[PDB]
């Protein structure tokens, strides 16, 4: 009857973001790859503060999407497979999340036409526990206790336990 069941970690959100500095053509295709990879329409993110150094307010810059549940675990493994389960100790946030990056998306390399192109992607994994809804529910929204909230090493141990991935300190 031990209550460790309610303390099991689980990936509840995986966000994939492609940031390109130009609006149109490149952003149109950068959305298509994210739709083909996951299966849901991404979000065209517009700039918040214009910067002449990067040649960017109202213009749409990036595209992102979040997948949850069984689909989140599938795409995370694909992103980890190309990384070969090689994650630095620095990649893990002090809150209990982590992320990494990808330069070439594997997807459909067969019909690699110049129209589709090659885009780099970044994976960010937001972990959780059963009981985290108490901060997201509309009625009686509260704060999760400090002990229940994750930590840097709690995520690291989860990474080494479910995927048998090592953490390097270089």
């Amino acid at each position: 009857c031990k209550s460790d069941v309610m303390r099991k970690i689980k990936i509840d959100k995986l966000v994939l973001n492609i940031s390109v500095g130009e609006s149109g053509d490149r952003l149109t295709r950068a959305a298509k790859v994210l739709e083909t990879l996951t299966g849901q329409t991404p979000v065209l993110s517009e700039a918040r503060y214009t910067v002449r150094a990067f040649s960017i307010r109202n213009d749409q810059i990036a595209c992102h999407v979040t997948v949850r549940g069984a689909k989140a675990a599938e795409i995370l493994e694909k992103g980890l497979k190309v990384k070969e389960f090689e994650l630095k100790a620095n990649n893990f946030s002090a809150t209990g999340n982590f992320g990494f990056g990808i330069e070439e998306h594997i997807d459909l390399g067969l019909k690699y036409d110049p129209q589709v192109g090659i885009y780099g992607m970044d994976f960010f994994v937001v972990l959780a526990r059963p009981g985290f809804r108490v901060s997201r529910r509309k009625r009686m929204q509260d704060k999760i206790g400090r002990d229940h909230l994750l930590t840097k090493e709690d995520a690291i141990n989860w990474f080494k336990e479910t995927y048998e991935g090592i953490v390097l300190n270089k």
Binding site: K138, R139, M140, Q141
Partner: protein
């Protein structure tokens, strides 16, 4: 190192806490003060609200009017007492919310004694069409407001299923039929969900799909032997058995003390013992 902690004493000396219930996350004090405000020229004439709150397992419906001392409850009705009327499982359905609302209307009119001239609708073929009580002779029906609370009002929400039951019981609640289970298609779309037609169309579908899923989702229904053809008739009889005996029905409560406060003598001695421990330790 760098902390720049914005939680210092200078931060608290000017902090302004919110209202206790709003600080708790239970009451919207911006819409509440619109549901409370009786006209000033109607001195101490109560303004009634149907406080419809749905927990994970019950449908709490109450009739309240506000005073400076507090809120006074004129009548109440829960779904956990529906087994007395023959409904044993699915106490939070769209079908069980209609029974909870209708039971409250008939329980209330029995108290005021106006339950013989205000009867609403009773037949099962008119469960889907709009009904609002009107003047009988020259006596207006009981008027009440729907307090929804922190619940979004979508076009299927159960808080309007409770409202539909109250209006069918003969209690006037101003509304529009654009947020019921219908508000599209017609009566039979609204009628089917009131009679549990949406629950007794998923048991059949699940039984076709999988046996594990069917027993996982409706495990206690199978033990009770409620076939997907009995739910529709169950709510017909429950409605019949409410309009005939709504007025309630039927000791020592076992306390469990938790900690109790420490007195000054015990609290002071804790410091002294710890201080003495520090002396010998250091």
């Amino acid at each position: 190192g760098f902390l720049k902690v914005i939680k210092n004493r200078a931060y608290f000396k000017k902090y302004q806490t919110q209202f206790r219930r709003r600080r708790e996350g239970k009451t919207d004090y911006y819409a509440r003060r619109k549901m409370i405000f009786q006209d000033k020229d109607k001195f101490k004439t109560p303004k009634y609200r149907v406080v419809v709150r749905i927990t994970n397992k019950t449908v709490i419906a109450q009739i309240a009017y506000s005073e400076i001392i507090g809120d006074k409850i004129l009548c109440a009705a829960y779904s956990h007492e529906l087994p007395r009327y023959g409904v044993k499982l699915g106490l939070t359905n769209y079908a069980a919310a209609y029974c909870t609302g209708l039971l409250l209307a008939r329980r209330l009119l029995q108290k005021l004694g106006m339950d013989k001239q205000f009867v609403g609708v009773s037949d099962a073929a008119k469960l889907g069409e709009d009904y609002t009580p009107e003047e009988v002779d020259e006596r207006r029906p009981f008027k009440c407001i729907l307090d929804v609370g922190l619940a979004r009002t979508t076009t299927g929400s159960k808080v309007f299923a409770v409202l539909k039951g109250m209006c069918d019981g003969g209690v006037y609640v101003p509304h529009s039929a654009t947020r019921f289970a219908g508000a599209g298609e017609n009566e039979e779309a609204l009628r089917s969900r009131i009679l549990g037609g949406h629950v007794a169309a998923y048991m059949k579908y699940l039984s076709g799909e999988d046996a594990d899923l069917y027993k996982k989702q409706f495990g206690r229904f199978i033990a009770a032997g409620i076939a997907p053809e009995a739910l529709e008739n169950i709510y017909i009889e429950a409605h019949k058995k409410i309009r005939e005996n709504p007025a309630a029905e039927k000791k020592e409560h076992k306390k469990y003390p938790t900690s109790k406060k420490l007195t000054l003598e015990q609290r002071k001695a804790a410091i002294q013992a710890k201080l003495a421990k520090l002396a010998q330790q250091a």
